[PDB]
């Protein structure tokens, strides 16, 4: 319902997004995405309140794409989060705040090293080894410093990600109906059905 | 505060009190309420200090431009500038203004303007907060078209009664005698009025 997760390892970024949607008092969808590819090896996952998420995600998909096809250079994850942060900061002052927290995980080609940014719904980016948003991410943080190393492969961070999700079933008062995992690798962007 | 203006036989005399409070603390006790917006047609401020002073400049601004194109205004005209500005800023600003002037044709005149932007001509007008208290004295002791000596002491006694019952009034009693003859300023110190 609000769960987006990030584990940056030493060759990829691992993003997870909720499959559940709840509008109103009921679950409308048990199977969904809350994440949209921006660039070939830049993935932006998004969550927050209803309908800020839908509209401002595609708004950003557009801007980032307009640039990267036109000039045929795929922006650094560094450049991308900065653009998203500029619209996020702008909007708090303006008439409509856009209620959305984004993990922008991308694979830098200009550094051949993954990068994971956390942008809070205010517009402040901060790069991290791993990241979360919401109250659900509060649960998960305390596993992350424990088991993470600065030598983690994709395989290690997928096995770490199993413990964190299983923590979520017990401790969160609500479900999330599993997660879509997408692994933002140097070869492309792949979806796996692991939890 | 207490202000008043009263017509009489040979002109109109405007009367005021130069106490100006903020809260319990009297901010200044020598701030005049008698404002020249035309050289023979003066006006009287009451209510909030800021709001009236600010409007009085606007109204002065358009009677400088009026006198220079159309020649000298009448008392009616000065008041009508005020009226129509306090109507368009009445849910924004508050005023008590007594506008009174000497014209040759019509002698002394007193108009009063509440904060809704109504104008009303009267033989005598009273405003301020002490106006209420001295209301009973004013219509009882006023005479229609009395000499100058009776008008000076009437406004003196009326404003001595205001200051006795309204403690936001005091400082001194000032007066402007607008007459055929010209502008003769008065001030009466506290020891003079206390007795009378």
């Amino acid at each position: 319902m609000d769960i987006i997760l990030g584990i940056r390892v030493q060759d990829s970024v691992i993003l997870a997004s909720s499959k559940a949607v709840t509008r109103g008092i009921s679950v409308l969808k048990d199977s969904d995405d809350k994440t949209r590819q921006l660039s070939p090896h830049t993935l932006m996952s998004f969550a927050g309140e209803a309908g800020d998420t839908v509209q401002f995600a595609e708004y950003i998909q557009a801007n980032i794409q307009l640039y990267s096809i036109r000039e045929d250079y795929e922006l650094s994850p560094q450049a991308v989060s900065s653009f998203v942060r500029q619209e996020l900061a702008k909007s708090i002052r303006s008439r409509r705040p856009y209620q959305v927290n984004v993990l922008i995980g991308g694979y830098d080609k200009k550094k051949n090293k993954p990068e994971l940014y956390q942008i809070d719904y205010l517009g402040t980016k901060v790069e991290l080894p791993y990241g979360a948003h919401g109250y659900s991410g509060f649960y998960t943080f305390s596993l992350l410093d424990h088991h993470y190393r600065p030598d983690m492969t994709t395989e290690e961070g997928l096995d770490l990600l199993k413990l964190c999700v299983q923590e979520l079933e017990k401790r969160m008062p609500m479900d999330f109906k599993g997660v879509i995992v997408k692994i933002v690798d140097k070869d492309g962007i792949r979806q796996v059905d692991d939890f | 505060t207490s202000i008043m203006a009263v017509t009489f036989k040979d002109g109109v005399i405007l009367g005021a009190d130069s106490r100006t409070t903020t809260g319990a603390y009297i901010a200044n006790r020598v701030t005049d309420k008698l404002t020249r917006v035309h050289d023979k047609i003066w006006c009287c401020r009451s209510g909030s200090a800021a709001d009236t002073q600010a409007i009085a400049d606007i109204v002065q601004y358009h009677l400088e431009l009026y006198t220079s194109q159309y020649g000298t205004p009448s008392t009616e005209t000065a008041a009508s500038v005020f009226k129509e500005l306090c109507y368009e800023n009445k849910d924004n600003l508050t005023a008590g203004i007594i506008v009174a002037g000497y014209d040759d044709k019509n002698k002394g005149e007193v108009y009063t303007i509440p904060l809704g932007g109504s104008v009303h001509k009267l033989p005598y007008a009273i405003a301020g907060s002490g106006s209420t208290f001295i209301y009973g004295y004013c219509d009882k002791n006023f005479r229609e078209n009395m000499s100058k000596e009776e008008t000076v002491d009437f406004i003196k006694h009326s404003l001595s009664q205001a200051i006795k019952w309204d403690g936001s009034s005091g400082g001194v009693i000032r007066m402007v005698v607008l007459t055929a003859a010209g502008v003769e300023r008065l001030i009466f110190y506290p020891d003079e009025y206390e007795q009378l």
């Binding site: 000039e71 922006l75 560094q78 450049a79 200009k110 | -």
Partner: protein
Amino acid sequence: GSRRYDSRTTIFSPEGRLYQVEYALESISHAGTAIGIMASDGIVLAAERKVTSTLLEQDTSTEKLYKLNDKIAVAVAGLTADAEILINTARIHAQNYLKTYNEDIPVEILVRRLSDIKQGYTQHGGLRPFGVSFIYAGYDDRYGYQLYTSNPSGNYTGWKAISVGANTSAAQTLLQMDYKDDMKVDDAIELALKTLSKTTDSSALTYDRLEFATIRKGANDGEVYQKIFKPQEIKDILVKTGIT
């Protein structure tokens, strides 16, 4: 009234050709020589002033060389007055790119933006375009050193060696014979001075009438140092290359 004194300034000719742009190219030929040479370790920008006098202070002047941003400077050839507007537009645009992406502007983006303004003025408003030609020296990570010329119509073309302003043909022909891709910034400094001595706009070429600037990756850690040489540092290099 208003239509009476207008002559329809910006329109096509029967050839298709824009009167004001054709006229504009004439006025850039009045203005002095400016040459750009792209080495494999930098870009050399070398310009000979269109004014010189013994009473003219030329020792604080930087009337052709202006930095748009930390990695992109221009040399000017045309109207100094007209150029001033585009120079401060460029500074605003480069800083705007830095503000929004937190990344330095590539050379391609900045040149394209200025070009759009020049086209726009003949397209609408009846405005005269800017009668200037710039040579952009710029570094970016992606394409490395990039060299660009812009013309007053509002179009940009890449080069390796190029000259604008006075004596464009003469400078170009000498460059074709001498230019090599194995040239360094050292070699390019010597070539630029020699070319300006054969395309001189009076009967003498001097340090005090020379503006000179490089952008060199010889600064430590792969960083780029823009150096605009003072006329007495030009003088040092004038004796080095044997012009004097």
